[PDB]
Each structure stands twice: as C-alpha cells, then as structure tokens.
Amino acid sequence: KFGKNKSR
C-alpha cells in the first residue's frame, strides 16, 4: 500500500 500511487 505504498507503491499504489506510483502508476500515473
């Protein structure tokens, strides 16, 4: 739940 905002 740390690399979930590493998409866009």
From Swiss-Prot:
Sites where a glycan is attached: 5
Superkingdom, taxonomy of origin: Eukaryota
Posttranslational mods: Poly-N-acetyllactosaminic carbohydrate moiety seems to be needed for TLR4 activation.
Compartmental location: Secreted; Cytoplasmic granule
Subunit architecture: Monomer. Found in a complex with LTF, CLU, EPPIN and SEMG1. Found in a complex with MPO and LTF; interacts directly with CP, allows Fe(3+) incorporation into LTF and activation of CP ferroxidase activity.
Function field: Transferrins are iron binding transport proteins which can bind two Fe(3+) ions in association with the binding of an anion, usually bicarbonate.
Similarity comment text for this entry: Belongs to the transferrin family.
Protein name: Lactotransferrin
